[PDB]
Amino acid sequence: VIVTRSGAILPKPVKMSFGLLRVFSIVIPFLYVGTLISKNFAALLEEHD
Amino acid sequence: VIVTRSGAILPKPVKMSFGLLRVFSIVIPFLYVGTLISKNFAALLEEHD
Amino acid sequence: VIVTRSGAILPKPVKMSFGLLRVFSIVIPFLYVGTLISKNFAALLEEHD
Amino acid sequence: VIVTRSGAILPKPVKMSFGLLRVFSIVIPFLYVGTLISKNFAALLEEH
Amino acid sequence: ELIERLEDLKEQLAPLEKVRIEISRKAEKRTTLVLWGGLAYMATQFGILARLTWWEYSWDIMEPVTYFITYGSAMAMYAYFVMTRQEYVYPEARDRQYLLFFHKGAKKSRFDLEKYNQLKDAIAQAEMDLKRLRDPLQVH
Amino acid sequence: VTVVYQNGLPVISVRLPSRRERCQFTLKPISDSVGVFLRQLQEEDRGIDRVAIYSPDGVRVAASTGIDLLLLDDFKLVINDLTYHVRPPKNDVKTLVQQLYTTLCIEQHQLNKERELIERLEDLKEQLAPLEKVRIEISRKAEKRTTLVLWGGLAYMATQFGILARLTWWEYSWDIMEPVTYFITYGSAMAMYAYFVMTRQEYVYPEARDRQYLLFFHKGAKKSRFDLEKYNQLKDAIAQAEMDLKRLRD
Amino acid sequence: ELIERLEDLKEQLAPLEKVRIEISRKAEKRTTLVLWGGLAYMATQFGILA
Amino acid sequence: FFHKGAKKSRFDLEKYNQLKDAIAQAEMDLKRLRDPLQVHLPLRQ
Amino acid sequence: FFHKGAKKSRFDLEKYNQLKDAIAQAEMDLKRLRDPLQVHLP
Amino acid sequence: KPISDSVGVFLRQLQEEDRGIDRVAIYSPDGVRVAASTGIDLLLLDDFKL
C-alpha cells in the first residue's frame, strides 16, 4: 500500500474526528433500549397465556 | 468506487420482479414442508424401531 | 467473468476425473482412523489414569 | 501468481528469520500468565 | 482553438454542478443514517439477549434462540446475493445504496444526469489531448 | 419512411403502392449500390412500372451510386405513382509541411533534451540524500510500533485463550461461562463493523496494518520536523524524468 | 478498408447469434432455478430443526 | 450449462468467439485511426 | 517449493528469467513493426 | 469520391447507367486524353472536356 509506483508517500487517511464518542453513544443508549425492551415484553406475554 | 475514472457516474442497477415477496413466498412453504417431513420421520422411527 | 472483453465466450473449464469419488476415497478411509485411534486412546488412558 | 505477464518466474517469497521460534515464545507464556491472573481476579470477586 | 474549447466545456460544466452536489448531499444524508442504523440494530440485539440470559432467565433456552439468530443472519446474507446478484461485502453495499439514492434524487430534482455524465467525458478527452499537444519531447 | 441503424444496418420499412405488406429491408451502408438494392426491391413485388430514387429537385440519381452517399441527404423515393420524401437521422498542406519539418528537427532535439534531463535527474538525486536519511529512520521507528501491534494482537489472542482456558474447567462451570464466551464473539463482530463505520475500511489484516502504519508514520515524522511534501515531490519528479528518458530510446 | 472489413464481420454475426441467445436463455433457466434451489436447501434446514 | 446446451443444440463456438474477436480487433484499429486524422497528433501503438 | 527444487536440481532460474524476458521483448518489438497502420514493410 | 474513384471508374459507371452510350473520353484543355487511372482530384483542378 505504502509503495507508490514512483516511490512517494501516500497522504494521510482521514480519521472520523470525534467519532469515537459517536460510536460509543449509539452503542450504549440503544443497548439500554434493547435492554429495557426485553423485561417488559416477556413478563407481559407469559402472564397472559 | 462510485465516481468512474473519467469523472462520470456509474449507471443505476436493477431490481428483479417483486423479489422480496417471492423470497418471502419461497421461505415460508418449505418451513412447513420441513416440519411435515420431521413429523413423517418422527412417526416412522417410533412406529418401526 | 462469463464473457470476454471482446464479447467472446470463456472456454470449458477442465474437470478432474472421479471428483465425485476422489473426495470420498480419502474421507472414508481416514474417518476410520480418527474413529479407531480415540477409542484406543481411551482404552490406553483407562489403565494409566 | 505463478508466472509474470511474460511467463518469467517470480522471485523468492521471503520467510522471516526463525520466526516460529519468536512466535512460540510469545504464545505459551502469555497463555500461562492469562491462565494465572484469572485466579487473582476471581479471588477478590469471590470475597465480594 | 483547443484552449478555447476547454473553457467552453468548463462553462457548460459549471452551472449544473451545484444541484448535483446537493443531490449528492441528499444521498449521503440518506446513506449515513442507514450505515449508523446498522450498528444501532446490533446494539439493540445485544441488549435484547444480554439482559435476559445472564441473570433474568436461563441460558439453556436462549441458546436455541441464539443459534437460529446466527443462522437467520446466514440466510439474510444469501438473500441479498439472490436479489442484488453480487456478494454482500461492507464497502460494496453502501456504495450501491448511495448510488441508488443519488439516482432517486436525480428524478426528484430532474437535473439531466444523462447529459451530465455524457458531458464529463468529452472534457476529460480534450483535457488529455491538451496534455498530449504540449508533449515536451516532440516540438509543437 | 423509417431509417434506423440501431441493428448496425439502416433498415427501411416500406410498403408498396396499393398493397398491404409493410416489409423491412436490411442493406449495407457503403458496399451496396442504389441500382442493385432496387433490383432486390423489384424482384419480389409486382408494381414495377416505375421504381426510382430522385433528388428533391427532380433530378434522377445514378444507379451505381452508394447507399451512404444517398442517405447523407434527402431524396424522393418514387414507386409507380406517389412520392416518399425521406429525411434520415443526421489547411491540409500546412499540417503536412509541419510533419515534414519535425522530422528534420527532433534528431537534434532529443540529444538536446537528453544532456539536460540527465542534469535534472542528477540535481534532484543530490537533494534526495539527507531527507532519505531522515525518512529511513522515521520509517524504522514507525515500523517497530507497527510490528508491536501485530504481536500485541496475538498477545491478546493468547491471554484471552488462557482466561477462557482455566476458569471453564476449574472453579466455574462451562454451563455458566459459555454465555460469557459467546458475547466476546458477538462484541468482536460489532467491533469489526465499528472499524468499518469509523474509518471507512473493510477489516482485513494487510490493509489494517497499513492503515495503522500511516497514522504512526505521518505523526512520527511531524513530531520530528520532517517535510514529507519535499520528499514525495522529489520522488515524483525523478520518476517523471525516468519515464521521460525511457521514451527516447525505444 | 477497415470499415468495409467490419461491414462483412457484422453481416455474418446476425444468423449465428440466434442459436447463441437461445442457448444462453435456455442455460440461464437452470442457473436461476439452481440458485433458488440452493436457497431451498437452506430454507428446509431452518424448518427441520424447529 | 452453456457448454452443455451448446453441445445439446449443436452450436459451433470456435467460429463464434473468433467472429467476435475479429470485430473487436477491427474496432481497436478504428479507435486508433480517430486520433491522427481528426486530432493531427501522432499515433500510439 | 520451486526455489529449493531448482537449487537441488542446479539449473538456472536467472537465465530462464532474463531470457524469457527478451523473448516477449523481441516479440513486442516485432509486433510494433508489423503494424498494418504504420507502414514500413510494403 | 475523390479519394477512391478514378476516371476509369467514373466512365465505367456512366457506361453502366445507359446502353446507348458507346464512346467516352475525358480530354484536357489541350487536345490530349486523360487515361483511366487518374485520380478525380487530379482531374478537378482545371476545366475539362467530356
CSV table of N, CA, C and O in Angstrom, one decimal, chain G residues 7-49:
chain,number,residue,atom,x,y,z
G,7,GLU,N,-17.8,-4.2,-42.0
G,7,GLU,CA,-19.2,-4.4,-42.5
G,7,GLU,C,-19.5,-5.9,-42.7
G,7,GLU,O,-20.6,-6.4,-42.3
G,8,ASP,N,-18.6,-6.7,-43.3
G,8,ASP,CA,-18.8,-8.1,-43.5
G,8,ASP,C,-18.9,-8.9,-42.2
G,8,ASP,O,-19.7,-9.8,-42.1
G,9,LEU,N,-18.0,-8.5,-41.3
G,9,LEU,CA,-18.0,-9.2,-40.0
G,9,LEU,C,-19.2,-8.9,-39.2
G,9,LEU,O,-19.6,-9.7,-38.3
G,10,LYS,N,-19.9,-7.8,-39.4
G,10,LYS,CA,-21.2,-7.5,-38.8
G,10,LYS,C,-22.3,-8.2,-39.5
G,10,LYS,O,-23.2,-8.7,-38.9
G,11,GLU,N,-22.2,-8.3,-40.9
G,11,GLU,CA,-23.2,-9.1,-41.6
G,11,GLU,C,-23.2,-10.5,-41.3
G,11,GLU,O,-24.3,-11.2,-41.3
G,12,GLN,N,-22.1,-11.1,-41.0
G,12,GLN,CA,-22.0,-12.6,-40.7
G,12,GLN,C,-22.5,-12.9,-39.3
G,12,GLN,O,-22.8,-14.0,-39.0
G,13,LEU,N,-22.5,-11.9,-38.4
G,13,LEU,CA,-22.9,-12.1,-37.0
G,13,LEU,C,-24.3,-12.5,-36.8
G,13,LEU,O,-24.7,-13.3,-35.9
G,14,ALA,N,-25.2,-11.8,-37.6
G,14,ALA,CA,-26.7,-11.9,-37.4
G,14,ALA,C,-27.3,-13.3,-37.4
G,14,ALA,O,-28.2,-13.5,-36.6
G,15,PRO,N,-26.9,-14.3,-38.3
G,15,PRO,CA,-27.6,-15.6,-38.1
G,15,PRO,C,-27.1,-16.4,-36.9
G,15,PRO,O,-27.8,-17.1,-36.3
G,16,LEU,N,-25.8,-16.2,-36.6
G,16,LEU,CA,-25.1,-17.1,-35.6
G,16,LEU,C,-25.5,-16.7,-34.2
G,16,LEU,O,-25.4,-17.5,-33.3
G,17,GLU,N,-25.9,-15.4,-34.0
G,17,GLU,CA,-26.3,-15.0,-32.6
G,17,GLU,C,-27.6,-15.6,-32.2
G,17,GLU,O,-27.9,-15.5,-31.0
G,18,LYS,N,-28.4,-16.1,-33.1
G,18,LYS,CA,-29.7,-16.6,-32.8
G,18,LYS,C,-29.7,-17.8,-31.9
G,18,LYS,O,-30.3,-17.9,-30.8
G,19,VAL,N,-28.9,-18.8,-32.3
G,19,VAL,CA,-28.6,-20.0,-31.5
G,19,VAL,C,-27.9,-19.7,-30.3
G,19,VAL,O,-28.1,-20.3,-29.2
G,20,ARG,N,-27.0,-18.7,-30.3
G,20,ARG,CA,-26.3,-18.2,-29.1
G,20,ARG,C,-27.2,-17.7,-28.0
G,20,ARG,O,-27.2,-18.1,-26.9
G,21,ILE,N,-28.2,-16.8,-28.4
G,21,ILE,CA,-29.1,-16.2,-27.5
G,21,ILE,C,-30.1,-17.3,-27.0
G,21,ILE,O,-30.5,-17.3,-25.8
G,22,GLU,N,-30.4,-18.2,-27.9
G,22,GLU,CA,-31.3,-19.3,-27.5
G,22,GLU,C,-30.7,-20.2,-26.4
G,22,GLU,O,-31.3,-20.5,-25.4
G,23,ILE,N,-29.4,-20.6,-26.6
G,23,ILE,CA,-28.7,-21.5,-25.7
G,23,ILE,C,-28.4,-20.7,-24.4
G,23,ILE,O,-28.5,-21.3,-23.3
G,24,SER,N,-28.2,-19.4,-24.5
G,24,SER,CA,-28.0,-18.6,-23.3
G,24,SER,C,-29.2,-18.4,-22.4
G,24,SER,O,-29.2,-18.6,-21.2
G,25,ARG,N,-30.4,-18.2,-23.1
G,25,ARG,CA,-31.7,-18.2,-22.4
G,25,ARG,C,-32.0,-19.5,-21.8
G,25,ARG,O,-32.6,-19.6,-20.7
G,26,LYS,N,-31.7,-20.6,-22.5
G,26,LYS,CA,-32.0,-21.9,-22.0
G,26,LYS,C,-31.1,-22.4,-20.9
G,26,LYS,O,-31.5,-23.2,-20.1
G,27,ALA,N,-29.9,-21.8,-20.9
G,27,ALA,CA,-28.9,-22.3,-19.8
G,27,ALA,C,-29.0,-21.4,-18.6
G,27,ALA,O,-28.7,-21.9,-17.5
G,28,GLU,N,-29.5,-20.1,-18.7
G,28,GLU,CA,-29.7,-19.3,-17.5
G,28,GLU,C,-31.0,-19.8,-16.8
G,28,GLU,O,-31.1,-19.6,-15.6
G,29,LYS,N,-31.9,-20.5,-17.5
G,29,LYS,CA,-33.1,-21.0,-17.0
G,29,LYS,C,-32.8,-22.1,-15.9
G,29,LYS,O,-33.6,-22.3,-15.0
G,30,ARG,N,-31.7,-22.8,-16.0
G,30,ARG,CA,-31.2,-23.7,-15.0
G,30,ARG,C,-30.5,-23.0,-13.9
G,30,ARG,O,-30.5,-23.5,-12.7
G,31,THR,N,-29.7,-22.0,-14.2
G,31,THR,CA,-28.9,-21.3,-13.2
G,31,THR,C,-29.8,-20.5,-12.2
G,31,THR,O,-29.5,-20.6,-11.0
G,32,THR,N,-30.8,-19.9,-12.6
G,32,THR,CA,-31.7,-19.2,-11.7
G,32,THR,C,-32.4,-20.2,-10.8
G,32,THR,O,-32.5,-20.0,-9.6
G,33,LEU,N,-32.9,-21.3,-11.4
G,33,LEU,CA,-33.6,-22.3,-10.6
G,33,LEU,C,-32.6,-23.0,-9.6
G,33,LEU,O,-33.0,-23.4,-8.5
G,34,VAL,N,-31.3,-23.2,-10.0
G,34,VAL,CA,-30.4,-23.8,-9.0
G,34,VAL,C,-30.0,-22.8,-7.9
G,34,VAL,O,-29.7,-23.2,-6.8
G,35,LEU,N,-30.1,-21.5,-8.2
G,35,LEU,CA,-29.9,-20.5,-7.1
G,35,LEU,C,-31.1,-20.6,-6.2
G,35,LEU,O,-30.9,-20.6,-4.9
G,36,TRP,N,-32.3,-20.7,-6.7
G,36,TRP,CA,-33.4,-20.8,-5.8
G,36,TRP,C,-33.4,-22.1,-5.1
G,36,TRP,O,-33.9,-22.3,-3.9
G,37,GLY,N,-32.9,-23.2,-5.7
G,37,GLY,CA,-32.8,-24.5,-5.1
G,37,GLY,C,-31.7,-24.5,-4.0
G,37,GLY,O,-31.9,-25.1,-2.9
G,38,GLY,N,-30.6,-23.8,-4.2
G,38,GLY,CA,-29.6,-23.6,-3.1
G,38,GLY,C,-30.2,-22.7,-2.0
G,38,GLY,O,-29.7,-22.9,-0.8
G,39,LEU,N,-31.1,-21.8,-2.3
G,39,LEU,CA,-31.9,-21.2,-1.2
G,39,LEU,C,-32.8,-22.2,-0.5
G,39,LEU,O,-33.0,-22.1,0.7
G,40,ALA,N,-33.4,-23.2,-1.2
G,40,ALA,CA,-34.3,-24.1,-0.7
G,40,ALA,C,-33.7,-25.1,0.3
G,40,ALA,O,-34.3,-25.4,1.3
G,41,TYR,N,-32.5,-25.5,0.0
G,41,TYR,CA,-31.7,-26.4,1.0
G,41,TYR,C,-31.4,-25.6,2.3
G,41,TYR,O,-31.4,-26.3,3.4
G,42,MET,N,-31.2,-24.3,2.2
G,42,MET,CA,-31.0,-23.5,3.4
G,42,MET,C,-32.3,-23.3,4.1
G,42,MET,O,-32.4,-23.2,5.3
G,43,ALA,N,-33.4,-23.2,3.3
G,43,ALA,CA,-34.7,-22.9,3.9
G,43,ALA,C,-35.3,-24.1,4.7
G,43,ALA,O,-35.9,-24.0,5.8
G,44,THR,N,-35.1,-25.3,4.1
G,44,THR,CA,-35.7,-26.5,4.8
G,44,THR,C,-35.0,-26.9,6.0
G,44,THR,O,-35.5,-27.5,7.0
G,45,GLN,N,-33.7,-26.6,6.1
G,45,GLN,CA,-32.9,-26.9,7.3
G,45,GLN,C,-33.2,-26.0,8.5
G,45,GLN,O,-33.1,-26.4,9.6
G,46,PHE,N,-33.7,-24.8,8.2
G,46,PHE,CA,-34.3,-24.0,9.3
G,46,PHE,C,-35.6,-24.5,9.7
G,46,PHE,O,-36.0,-24.3,10.9
G,47,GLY,N,-36.4,-25.2,8.9
G,47,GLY,CA,-37.6,-25.8,9.3
G,47,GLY,C,-37.5,-27.1,10.1
G,47,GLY,O,-38.1,-27.2,11.2
G,48,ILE,N,-36.6,-28.0,9.7
G,48,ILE,CA,-36.5,-29.3,10.3
G,48,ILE,C,-35.8,-29.3,11.7
G,48,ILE,O,-35.8,-30.3,12.4
G,49,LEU,N,-35.2,-28.1,12.1
G,49,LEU,CA,-34.7,-28.0,13.4
G,49,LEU,C,-35.5,-27.2,14.3
G,49,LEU,O,-35.1,-26.9,15.5
